């Protein structure tokens, strides 16, 4: 019985308040987030009630299915994906039970008028911290507001640090979810602190020192990083807030801030800036790998490739060839190792001595080691069975109970939790991780009459991991204190939209303005505001693909035959606007070799064509509503031969024209090398000669 249906005493008070009145539950970094969802799913796991899932992950769905099968539920929850036909979904939604659908198919199924509505009890919203932005999750909640009674929405989240963001209020996210009340259960609560006080393990913190050579190496690395930061700030005073000092560069939210501040990459294009960015990234990854891995792989696997990359060209920059030479002396002389392995061996020998001295009428404990990645785990497993000097010699000559399991990786945490629950340990070694500490605390609090488990700590003097764990805790505390203070301070129109045009942000913003949406299947056009107008939207990338293949002309010639005024809309970007002009060909060509050149011919051949431009998706949403001031509402019910063919495809030719041209000239090179005077003299029309001169004489850029 892995799945536990009953909850703790401090968790029964919330279910009594969330069942009556709906509200948002914010956990303390996974403070029973999945435990409440699994309990709420069992209460609605009946064929009569229909409860749909908003958005989940495939790694947790299989675990939930296995847990519900172990519990012995009469009806197992199904999963609807893009693996069957659209007609087959009519039998799955009508059977009942929990259905794990996707975030993209649920909108199409709801807007295609094929979902058995008027009988759904509700929809459980999971991971509500991602609805801050105008994503596809808001459209599902907006379209769900169609039930008069028995309509409820439960939103669950466990990321309290995501709400502490500028230009992002909590009221804007609360109003987009149709939720009135709001609940909170932080770590500073009394009911949570009083229950977890009587069940706390004994944690032992051990400070590990470092070698003097490693200290000098870190000092030199920090000096080089500060010099690079000063050189970057001297030649770039614009992005000053992104890099205030050298302490922010060592932190984690540095690359994201750099990529956010340096948005115009095509405007600030520079070799020195890119070289300095690459040098900063190299100094960061080297300082990371020096503390994460051993020193032999830092010199043989990292310091060897960088020298070859610098000697091959300007990949790593030439400024690292005549600077920081002492780093080449300390790395080559290191031989020694890191005190972390010595401390681990001492801890292991102490645990062994304690188990041997207390082996009388007492069972020993299965000590396990936790690693950050798989490489560190493999290194720790190979160093124990072989040794220190033996492994150091093997790695140098190659290129020239007691179970270890990684923590971070692609593996789901459910597997690690099952592994930890399979065998009960007595001494656990952690890497100063908050998630593992919370898991160990929950495990110790779940079993009251259990054995006293001891958690060891490994924090180096002035290391990056300790600073990161402190900054994360400080940010979490600040976000919680801000959320607590914010909580304690409180004639219609229709538009026909194509089914294949639901992935864009336009339908998500059209329904928000107040106008209704009446979608139906179609074949031509994407947006129909009135029966006399049809609009098709094309992005800055799809327009080129539609103009190069030729489907745009076929779609335009098929729409103007029945409708009155078929128009189109072009969506571009104001940050990086394409000039649609060749710099190196505007002087050697007669204004050709451009997408706009073909667009001009397309809009000239069709006189009933309008070209619209919008820089942001928020502009077209208002333009579509402004065009319906006095227009009526549309209805949903009304919705030898070789050279011959080579010359025929040439622009500015015809039947008689080609017949007269082929009777005079013989080859194509003679008319290609000749000027347009003879061509306009033998024909008369200068337009065809100008077209031929523009086509056969152009430049590429």
């Amino acid at each position: 019985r892995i799945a536990m249906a009953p909850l703790l005493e401090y968790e029964r008070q919330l279910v009594l308040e969330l069942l009556d009145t709906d509200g948002l539950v914010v956990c303390a970094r996974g403070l029973g987030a999945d435990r409440l969802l699994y309990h709420f799913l069992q209460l609605h796991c009946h064929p009569a009630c229909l409860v749909l899932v908003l958005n989940t992950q495939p790694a947790e769905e299989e675990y939930f299915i296995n847990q519900l099968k172990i519990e012995g539920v009469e009806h197992l929850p199904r999963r609807v994906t893009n693996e069957i036909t659209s007609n087959s979904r009519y039998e799955v939604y009508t059977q009942g039970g929990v259905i794990f659908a996707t975030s993209r198919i649920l909108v199409v199924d709801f807007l295609t008028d094929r979902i058995p509505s008027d009988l759904i009890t509700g929809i459980l919203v999971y991971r509500a911290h991602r609805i801050i932005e105008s994503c596809q999750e808001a459209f599902i909640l907006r379209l769900f507001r169609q039930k008069n009674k028995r309509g409820f929405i439960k939103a669950f989240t466990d990321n309290a640090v995501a709400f502490d963001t500028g230009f992002c209020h909590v009221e804007r996210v609360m109003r987009n979810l149709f939720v009135r009340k709001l609940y909170l259960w932080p770590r500073f609560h009394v009911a949570v602190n009083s229950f977890l006080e009587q069940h706390k393990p004994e944690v032992v913190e051990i400070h590990v020192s470092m070698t003097p050579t490693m200290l000098a190496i870190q000092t030199a690395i920090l000096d080089i990083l500060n010099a690079c930061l000063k050189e970057l700030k001297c030649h770039n005073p614009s992005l000053e807030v992104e890099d205030l000092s050298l302490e922010n560069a060592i932190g984690k939210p540095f690359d994201k801030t750099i990529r956010h501040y340096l948005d115009p990459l095509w405007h600030q294009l520079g070799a020195k800036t890119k070289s300095l960015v690459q040098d900063l990234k190299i100094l960061r990854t080297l300082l990371q790998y020096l503390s994460q891995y051993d020193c032999v792989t830092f010199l043989n696997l990292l310091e060897s490739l960088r020298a070859t990359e610098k000697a091959f060209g300007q990949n790593s920059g030439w400024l690292f060839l005549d600077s920081s030479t002492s780093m080449f002396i300390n790395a080559r002389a290191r031989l020694e190792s890191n005190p972390k392995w010595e401390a681990l061996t001492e801890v292991l020998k102490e645990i062994e001595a304690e188990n041997k001295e207390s082996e009388a009428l007492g069972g020993p404990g299965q000590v396990l080691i936790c690693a950050s990645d798989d490489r560190t785990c493999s290194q720790l497993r190979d160093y124990i069975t072989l040794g220190a000097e033996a492994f150091l010699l093997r790695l140098y000559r190659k290129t020239f109970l007691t179970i270890i399991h990684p923590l971070l990786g692609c593996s789901d945490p459910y597997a690690l939790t099952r592994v930890l629950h399979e065998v009960e340990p007595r001494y656990v070694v952690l890497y100063d991780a908050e998630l593992t500490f919370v898991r160990q605390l929950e495990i110790y609090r779940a079993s009251r009459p259990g054995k006293p488990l001891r958690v060891y700590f490994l924090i180096y003097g002035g290391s990056t991991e300790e600073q990161r764990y402190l900054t994360a805790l400080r940010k979490e505390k600040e976000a919680f204190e801000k959320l607590i203070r914010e909580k304690a301070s409180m004639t219609q129109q229709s538009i026909v939209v194509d089914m294949r045009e639901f992935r864009s942000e336009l339908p998500s913003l059209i329904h928000r303005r107040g106008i209704d949406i009446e979608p139906v299947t179609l074949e031509v056009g994407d947006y129909i505001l009135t029966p006399e107008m049809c609009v098709e939207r094309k992005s800055i990338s799809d327009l080129i693909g539609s103009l190069n293949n030729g489907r745009l002309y076929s779609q335009c010639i098929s729409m103007s035959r029945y409708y009155k005024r078929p128009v189109l809309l072009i969506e571009f970007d104001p940050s990086k606007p394409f000039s649609l002009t060749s710099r190196g060909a505007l002087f050697q060509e007669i204004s050709s070799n451009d997408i706009s050149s073909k667009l001009t011919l397309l809009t000239l051949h069709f006189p009933r064509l309008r070209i619209l431009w919008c820089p942001s998706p928020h502009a077209t949403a208002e333009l579509f509503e402004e065009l319906k001031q006095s227009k009526p509402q549309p209805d949903a019910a009304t919705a030898n031969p070789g050279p011959q063919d080579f010359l025929l495809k040439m622009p500015g030719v015809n039947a008689k024209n080609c017949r007269s041209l082929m009777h005079h000239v013989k080859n194509i090179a003679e008319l290609a090398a000749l000027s347009q005077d003879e061509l306009t003299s033998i024909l008369g029309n200068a337009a065809n000669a100008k077209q031929l001169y523009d086509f056969i004489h152009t430049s590429f850029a």
Partner: protein, 191 residues
């Protein structure tokens, strides 16, 4: 053969056309691109400074030509209000909106509108060359793209010999030889 109105005296777009001759005449539209193709130059700064400038011109223009092409150049850092008004005016009236970013772009638009009286064969130059060269064999989209990115013009392709076309990998020498044999072979008999 374009005719420029005397009102556009200090216009930098007129100093960018070199492949099309222009003249002056007492014509109502500012730019006459042949027949039934009238162009009108207007900047966003002049529209923001004088809002009652394009409406009067559009009302006095009337319905004389078959197709009206109204080009506008954007110069404001926030083209959210003027662009919507221009689009609404172009939708209400009978004209085509053309977005420009520089006077050179407007000159290129004019030169393109001037010399595109050809047949509707469009069923960028890469698309045009891959649609006009696909009628003969040994030419596909990839081969056309390679010939455009390696030569840049049809003159350098028709001037090279058979040995000069067998050095590009990805298409083989036999395909280039067959293409040259189909190209340089005449269709009409000697008479």
């Amino acid at each position: 053969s374009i005719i420029v109105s005397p009102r556009q005296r200090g216009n930098p777009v007129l100093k960018f056309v070199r492949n099309v001759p222009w003249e002056f005449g007492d014509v109502i539209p500012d730019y006459v691109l042949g027949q039934s193709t009238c162009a009108l130059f207007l900047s966003l700064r002049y529209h923001n400074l004088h809002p009652d400038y394009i409406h009067g011109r559009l009302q006095s223009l009337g319905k004389n030509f078959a197709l009206r092409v109204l080009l506008v150049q954007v110069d404001v850092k926030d083209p959210q209000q003027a662009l919507k008004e221009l689009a609404k005016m172009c939708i209400l009236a009978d004209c085509t909106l053309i977005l420009a970013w520089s006077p050179e772009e407007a000159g290129r638009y004019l030169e393109t509108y001037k010399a595109y009286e050809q047949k509707p064969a469009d069923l960028d130059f890469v698309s045009r060359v891959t649609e006009c060269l696909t009628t003969v064999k040994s030419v596909n989209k990839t081969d056309s793209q390679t010939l455009l990115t390696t030569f840049g013009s049809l003159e350098q392709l028709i001037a090279a010999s058979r040995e000069d076309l067998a050095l590009c990998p990805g298409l083989g020498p036999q395909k280039a030889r067959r293409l040259f044999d189909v190209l340089h072979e005449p269709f009409l008999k000697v008479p």
